[PDB]
Amino acid sequence: GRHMNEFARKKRALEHSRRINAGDLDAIIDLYAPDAVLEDPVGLPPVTGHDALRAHYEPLLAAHLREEAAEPVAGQDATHALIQISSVMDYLPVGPLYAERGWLKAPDAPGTARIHRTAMLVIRMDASGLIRHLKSYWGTSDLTVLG
Amino acid sequence: MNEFARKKRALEHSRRINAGDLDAIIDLYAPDAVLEDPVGLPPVTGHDALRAHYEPLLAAHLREEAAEPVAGQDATHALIQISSVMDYLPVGPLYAERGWLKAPDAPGTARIHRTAMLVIRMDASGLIRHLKSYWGTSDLTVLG
């Protein structure tokens, strides 16, 4: 008994990419419901609630995570927006964790290498515009170690 | 199914739609496949309802251009963004009814553009168990 229209969900999905690029942690977290569930990537155990979300985004902000997002689409189901995201960030300090997980090799800078990743996000939003659930789909074949 | 395999099947789905052969598309689906197109509408399920879903699209000469897909680290998912164009008839009038677009001044030369993102769940054989096609009224445009 209340919901968010396609355009607001769409803009909201673009705002998530926007705030990630702006690098302010407080703003990124504000987009999530207090108990929001993040799967990044889908296939690994979910990150849930604000404190865990902060700890998830901090290393990404340290690696200077940079996203260029394509135009999102919307579901006709009152909650969803999907968006494709191309991303670049430094190998450090996240890369070694992706290496340990089995997702990529290990460059030879590594403090000058960068990582490219392609992902498609499935985003569930409630009537307040808060993200209740975000699934970031990307595999090892969507993960590349650049220069 | 490895990621590579999953990605290609996703691409193959767009290819067979473009080819226009009904049987070849349906052949990609598991016996109990579930299709949601669009997501938010009642699921289409079963061989016979899957055919009746794709038959008017084929008549509309639906063309898909697929972007590069991604795979989930979960052994089943591939996601793919799809831009599609089709003749306004015969499906347009359906969409216009529900208020998803405004009916054109032709309609015999008008086209329908659509942007969608698919979430495909496939079994070990590369058969589609579940396909969620996410597209909204704002992802739908009437051409000419």
TrEMBL record, chain A:
Single annotated GO MF: isomerase activity
Claim: Isomerase is one of the keywords in the record: yes
Xref: InterPro entries: NTF2-like_dom_sf, SnoaL-like
Gene3D superfamilies per UniProt: 3.10.450.50
Keyword check for Isomerase: yes
Lineage: Bacteria, Bacillati, Actinomycetota, Actinomycetes, Kitasatosporales
Keyword annotations of the record: Isomerase
Protein name per Swiss-Prot or TrEMBL: MonBI
Coiled coil: none
Superkingdom to which the source organism belongs: Bacteria
Positions of the SnoaL-like domain: 17-80
Listed Pfam families: SnoaL_2 (PF12680)
